[PDB]
From a paper:
The S-adenosyl-L-methionine-dependent tRNA 4-demethylwyosine synthase TYW1 catalyzes biosynthesis of 4-demethylwyosine (imG-14), the precursor for wyosine, the hypermodified guanine-derived nucleotide present at position 37 of phenylalanine tRNAs of archaea and eukarya. Eukaryotic TYW1 enzymes contain N-terminal flavodoxin-like and C-terminal radical-SAM domains.
Numbering used by the authors: 81 to 249
The structure:
Protein backbone atom coordinates (compact mmCIF):
# COMPACT_ATOMS: atom_id res chain seq x y z
CA UNK A 1 0.00 0.00 0.00
CA UNK A 2 1.28 3.47 -0.97
CA UNK A 3 3.39 5.41 1.61
CA UNK A 4 1.14 8.52 1.07
CA UNK A 5 -1.85 6.19 1.91
CA UNK A 6 -0.23 4.85 5.15
CA UNK A 7 -0.72 5.96 8.78
CA UNK A 8 2.83 6.66 10.20
CA UNK A 9 3.62 6.03 13.93
CA UNK A 10 6.86 7.70 15.17
CA UNK A 11 7.91 5.99 18.44
CA UNK A 12 10.62 7.63 20.59
CA UNK A 13 12.21 7.42 24.04
CA UNK A 14 14.04 10.32 25.76
CA UNK A 15 15.76 10.88 29.17
CA UNK A 16 17.19 14.38 28.39
CA UNK A 17 14.48 15.48 25.90
CA UNK A 18 16.56 15.81 22.67
CA UNK A 19 15.07 12.69 20.91
CA UNK A 20 11.54 14.20 21.53
CA UNK A 21 12.55 17.45 19.74
CA UNK A 22 14.21 15.36 16.94
CA UNK A 23 11.00 13.19 16.59
CA UNK A 24 8.83 16.39 16.25
CA UNK A 25 11.18 17.62 13.49
CA UNK A 26 11.16 14.22 11.65
CA UNK A 27 7.31 14.19 11.94
CA UNK A 28 7.05 17.77 10.49
CA UNK A 29 9.36 16.92 7.55
CA UNK A 30 7.31 13.75 6.76
CA UNK A 31 3.99 15.73 7.05
CA UNK A 32 5.22 18.46 4.60
CA UNK A 33 6.96 15.98 2.20
CA UNK A 34 3.87 13.64 1.85
CA UNK A 35 1.18 16.37 2.46
CA UNK A 36 -0.36 13.97 5.02
CA UNK A 37 -2.05 14.43 8.43
CA UNK A 38 -1.67 10.65 9.20
CA UNK A 39 1.60 11.02 11.25
CA UNK A 40 1.50 10.51 15.08
CA UNK A 41 4.39 10.74 17.61
CA UNK A 42 4.24 8.30 20.61
CA UNK A 43 6.51 8.27 23.71
CA UNK A 44 7.33 4.53 24.18
CA UNK A 45 7.26 5.10 28.03
CA UNK A 46 3.50 6.12 27.94
CA UNK A 47 2.23 3.43 25.55
CA UNK A 48 1.00 -0.20 25.98
CA UNK A 49 3.84 -2.00 24.09
CA UNK A 50 1.96 -5.32 23.45
CA UNK A 51 -0.91 -3.38 21.67
CA UNK A 52 1.60 -1.97 19.07
CA UNK A 53 4.40 -4.63 18.93
CA UNK A 54 2.15 -7.85 19.19
CA UNK A 55 -0.09 -6.99 16.17
CA UNK A 56 0.08 -4.62 13.16
CA UNK A 57 -2.05 -3.30 10.24
CA UNK A 58 -1.24 -3.45 6.49
CA UNK A 59 -1.68 0.39 6.28
CA UNK A 60 0.74 1.27 9.17
CA UNK A 61 4.47 2.17 9.17
CA UNK A 62 6.52 2.24 12.43
CA UNK A 63 9.48 4.67 12.73
CA UNK A 64 11.55 4.17 15.90
CA UNK A 65 13.76 7.09 17.09
CA UNK A 66 15.93 5.75 19.98
CA UNK A 67 18.86 7.19 21.97
CA UNK A 68 21.21 4.63 23.67
CA UNK A 69 22.04 4.59 27.41
CA UNK A 70 24.80 2.38 28.86
CA UNK A 71 23.08 2.86 32.32
CA UNK A 72 19.70 1.20 33.09
CA UNK A 73 16.78 3.18 31.59
CA UNK A 74 13.15 2.70 30.39
CA UNK A 75 14.78 1.79 26.98
CA UNK A 76 15.95 -1.54 28.58
CA UNK A 77 12.22 -2.22 29.22
CA UNK A 78 11.32 -1.45 25.55
CA UNK A 79 14.04 -3.92 24.29
CA UNK A 80 13.02 -6.64 26.88
CA UNK A 81 9.30 -6.26 25.85
CA UNK A 82 10.34 -6.89 22.17
CA UNK A 83 12.41 -10.00 23.23
CA UNK A 84 9.51 -11.34 25.42
CA UNK A 85 7.16 -11.01 22.36
CA UNK A 86 9.72 -12.87 20.14
CA UNK A 87 10.13 -15.67 22.77
CA UNK A 88 6.68 -16.11 24.53
CA UNK A 89 4.81 -19.27 23.23
CA UNK A 90 1.40 -17.55 23.96
CA UNK A 91 2.13 -15.02 21.13
CA UNK A 92 2.17 -16.23 17.47
CA UNK A 93 5.41 -16.06 15.36
CA UNK A 94 5.96 -12.93 13.17
CA UNK A 95 3.03 -10.95 14.66
CA UNK A 96 4.09 -7.76 12.66
CA UNK A 97 4.13 -9.59 9.24
CA UNK A 98 1.05 -7.46 8.20
CA UNK A 99 2.79 -4.06 9.00
CA UNK A 100 3.61 -2.04 5.84
CA UNK A 101 7.09 -1.82 7.44
CA UNK A 102 9.52 -0.16 9.88
CA UNK A 103 12.76 1.84 10.05
CA UNK A 104 15.00 2.81 13.01
CA UNK A 105 17.01 6.02 13.60
CA UNK A 106 19.44 5.87 16.57
CA UNK A 107 21.05 8.78 18.49
CA UNK A 108 24.39 8.24 20.29
CA UNK A 109 27.65 9.88 21.45
CA UNK A 110 30.50 8.54 19.27
CA UNK A 111 33.23 10.48 21.22
CA UNK A 112 32.37 8.68 24.48
CA UNK A 113 30.80 5.34 23.28
CA UNK A 114 32.65 4.43 19.99
CA UNK A 115 32.58 0.60 19.52
CA UNK A 116 29.95 -1.95 20.70
CA UNK A 117 28.05 0.74 22.72
CA UNK A 118 27.55 3.36 19.89
CA UNK A 119 23.73 3.40 19.24
CA UNK A 120 23.67 -0.19 20.63
CA UNK A 121 19.94 0.01 21.66
CA UNK A 122 18.87 1.31 18.17
CA UNK A 123 20.85 -1.62 16.62
CA UNK A 124 19.01 -4.08 18.97
CA UNK A 125 15.56 -2.49 18.15
CA UNK A 126 16.22 -2.84 14.37
CA UNK A 127 17.21 -6.58 14.72
CA UNK A 128 14.22 -7.41 17.01
CA UNK A 129 11.57 -5.61 14.86
CA UNK A 130 12.83 -7.72 11.86
CA UNK A 131 12.51 -10.92 14.04
CA UNK A 132 8.87 -9.85 14.86
CA UNK A 133 8.22 -10.14 11.05
CA UNK A 134 8.15 -6.37 10.25
CA UNK A 135 9.57 -5.62 6.75
CA UNK A 136 12.52 -3.18 7.05
CA UNK A 137 11.84 -0.22 4.66
CA UNK A 138 15.26 1.45 5.09
CA UNK A 139 18.60 0.61 6.70
CA UNK A 140 19.25 1.68 10.29
CA UNK A 141 20.38 5.35 10.51
CA UNK A 142 22.69 6.56 13.33
CA UNK A 143 23.33 10.18 14.40
CA UNK A 144 26.38 11.21 16.44
CA UNK A 145 24.87 13.98 18.66
CA UNK A 146 28.46 15.26 19.41
CA UNK A 147 28.75 16.71 15.84
CA UNK A 148 27.75 20.39 15.39
CA UNK A 149 23.94 20.81 15.79
CA UNK A 150 23.66 21.76 12.06
CA UNK A 151 25.24 18.35 11.13
CA UNK A 152 22.95 16.43 13.61
CA UNK A 153 19.93 18.05 11.85
CA UNK A 154 21.36 17.47 8.29
CA UNK A 155 21.95 13.78 9.24
CA UNK A 156 18.35 13.02 10.42
CA UNK A 157 16.95 15.04 7.42
CA UNK A 158 19.03 12.95 4.94
CA UNK A 159 17.80 9.75 6.72
CA UNK A 160 14.13 10.97 6.59
CA UNK A 161 14.50 11.69 2.81
CA UNK A 162 16.22 8.28 2.19
CA UNK A 163 13.33 6.63 4.13
CA UNK A 164 10.69 8.42 1.93
CA UNK A 165 12.65 7.43 -1.28
CA UNK A 166 12.92 3.68 -0.21
CA UNK A 167 9.19 3.65 0.81
CA UNK A 168 8.20 4.98 -2.70
CA UNK A 169 10.35 2.40 -4.65
C1 LIG B 1 24.69 8.43 31.03
C2 LIG B 1 24.76 8.38 29.53
C3 LIG B 1 25.03 7.17 28.89
C4 LIG B 1 25.11 7.10 27.50
N1 LIG B 1 25.34 5.93 26.90
C5 LIG B 1 25.43 5.87 25.57
C6 LIG B 1 25.73 4.61 24.89
O1 LIG B 1 25.89 3.56 25.56
N2 LIG B 1 25.79 4.62 23.57
C7 LIG B 1 25.65 5.75 22.85
O2 LIG B 1 25.72 5.70 21.61
N3 LIG B 1 25.37 6.92 23.40
C8 LIG B 1 25.23 7.04 24.73
N4 LIG B 1 24.93 8.27 25.34
C9 LIG B 1 24.68 9.49 24.57
C10 LIG B 1 23.13 9.60 24.49
O3 LIG B 1 22.49 8.53 23.79
C11 LIG B 1 22.74 10.82 23.69
O4 LIG B 1 23.15 11.89 24.51
C12 LIG B 1 21.25 10.96 23.32
O5 LIG B 1 21.19 12.14 22.52
C13 LIG B 1 20.30 11.12 24.52
O6 LIG B 1 19.00 11.49 24.03
P1 LIG B 1 17.89 12.10 25.00
O7 LIG B 1 18.33 13.55 25.20
O8 LIG B 1 16.67 12.00 24.14
O9 LIG B 1 17.88 11.24 26.27
C14 LIG B 1 24.86 8.34 26.73
C15 LIG B 1 24.62 9.57 27.39
C16 LIG B 1 24.54 9.64 28.79
C17 LIG B 1 24.24 10.96 29.52
MN1 LIG C 1 -1.32 -4.73 27.41
MN1 LIG D 1 -2.42 -5.12 26.14
Amino acid sequence: TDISACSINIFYSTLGGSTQKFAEHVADRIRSSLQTELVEILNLDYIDLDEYFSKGNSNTVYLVLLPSYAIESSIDYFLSALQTTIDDFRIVARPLEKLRGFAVLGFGDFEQYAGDLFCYQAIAADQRLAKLGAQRIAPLGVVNVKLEKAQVYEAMEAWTDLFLQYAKE
